[PDB]
């Protein structure tokens, strides 16, 4: 005999820094033959977050006390047409999202677009520290869900077009780390095939030193 439960989330909208918006417009609108590198950039970013756990451990030994494995999980979903990458890294604060994913990537942003103009391949994006935006080669929408110790769960979301949102996330608690959800373009469902994902990870990532596990839905 209870009243209707209802959760509330505050949502804020942000403009991308002009140069990140230019790069995102270039990535979304142009066909790149080597676009499979998007998955290497996701795995490499998860690896950076897992390294931050170990760094923090040096000076804050309580990190050692978590019983969570440091790992990366790949979860294609053909029904939803999503590729989800989950890691147990340190996660981001709300300030990180507003900054890390819409402003602080700004210096290699301009340098990468001049590298492309000079004839460099899309595969160089990772060396300019802006590999995250390669998700827009294959995804029409990206959601990032993240949890940092002593902070709230946040969702970042953008379909490009010059802005992103950040909100408190009252959904499924994910525990410490980051989940990236690629809503794939209709024509990019090859990247949900177990065989294609095995090829791409056998090729690119090579020497990331955290376990990677592909979860395949039994048909």
């Amino acid at each position: 005999t209870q009243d209707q439960p209802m959760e509330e989330e505050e949502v804020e909208t942000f403009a991308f820094q002009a140069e990140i918006a230019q790069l995102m417009s270039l990535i979304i609108n142009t066909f790149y033959s080597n676009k499979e590198i998007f998955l290497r950039e996701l795995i490499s970013n998860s690896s950076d977050a897992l390294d931050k756990i170990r760094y923090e451990s040096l000076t804050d030994p309580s990190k050692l006390d978590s019983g969570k494995e440091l790992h990366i999980n790949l979860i294609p979903n053909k029904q939803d047409r999503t590729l989800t990458i989950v890691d147990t890294g340190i996660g981001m604060t709300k300030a990180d999202l507003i900054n890390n994913l819409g402003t602080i990537a700004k210096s290699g942003t301009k340098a990468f677009m001049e590298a492309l103009q000079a004839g460099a391949d899309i595969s160089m994006i990772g060396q300019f520290g802006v590999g995250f935006y390669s998700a827009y080669l294959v995804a029409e929408k990206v959601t990032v869900i993240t949890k940092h110790n002593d902070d709230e769960q946040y969702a970042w979301e953008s379909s490009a077009g010059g802005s992103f949102t950040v909100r408190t996330d009252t959904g499924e608690p994910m525990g410490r780390g980051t989940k990236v959800i690629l809503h794939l373009k209709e024509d990019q469902t090859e990247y949900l095939e177990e065989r294609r994902i095995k090829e791409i990870v056998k090729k690119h990532s090579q020497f990331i030193g955290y376990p990677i596990t592909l979860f395949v839905e039994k048909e």
Binding site: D51, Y55, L58, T59, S107, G108, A111, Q127, G129
Partner: protein, 167 residues
């Protein structure tokens, strides 16, 4: 030739690599120096009575790992790991610089001093306790500096030389 120590100054853009180097070499403070200019600067010093040249590599340019860049950074006998006390990201990046030195010198036993720069400014975001906790974990000294006032500058470079004599 004469006794030379090759010191490399590393750390995030804007921490004061060039300001510390110029304060040491030319005893004045620069309010803005081209962030892309990578040079070595030489100065004769006397440290615990020994006369030597400090050859200071003021790291700049862009982040890349060409064989040329690796060989050049490998000649460094000692490294100043500089962060700014009002810039939390610069402190977090110390782990990156430590990794790359560890990498080209294939050792955890490279002479290094951790330097907390811009100690004159009131807008601290990184506590000294965190910096000393990090220095302790690496087994390296930690110096507070202000390139602006020259407080700690000679202390930081001379400590690094002493660190290189021990190793």
């Amino acid at each position: 030739g004469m006794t030379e120590y090759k010191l490399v100054v590393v750390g995030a853009c804007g921490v004061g690599k060039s300001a510390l180097t110029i304060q040491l070499i030319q005893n004045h403070f620069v309010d803005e120096y081209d962030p892309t200019i990578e040079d070595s600067y030489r100065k004769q010093v006397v440290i615990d009575g020994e006369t030597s040249l400090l050859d200071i590599l003021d790291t700049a340019g862009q982040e890349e790992y060409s064989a040329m860049r690796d060989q050049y950074m490998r000649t460094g006998e000692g490294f100043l790991l500089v962060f700014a006390i009002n810039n939390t990201k610069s402190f977090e990046d110390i782990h990156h610089y430590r990794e790359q030195i560890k990498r080209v010198k294939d050792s955890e036993d490279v002479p290094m001093v951790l330097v907390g720069n811009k100690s004159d400014l009131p807008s601290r975001t990184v506590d000294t306790k965190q910096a000393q906790d990090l220095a302790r974990s690496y087994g390296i000294p930690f110096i507070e500096t202000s390139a602006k006032t020259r407080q700690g500058v000679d202390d930081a470079f001379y400590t690094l030389v002493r660190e290189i004599r021990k190793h």
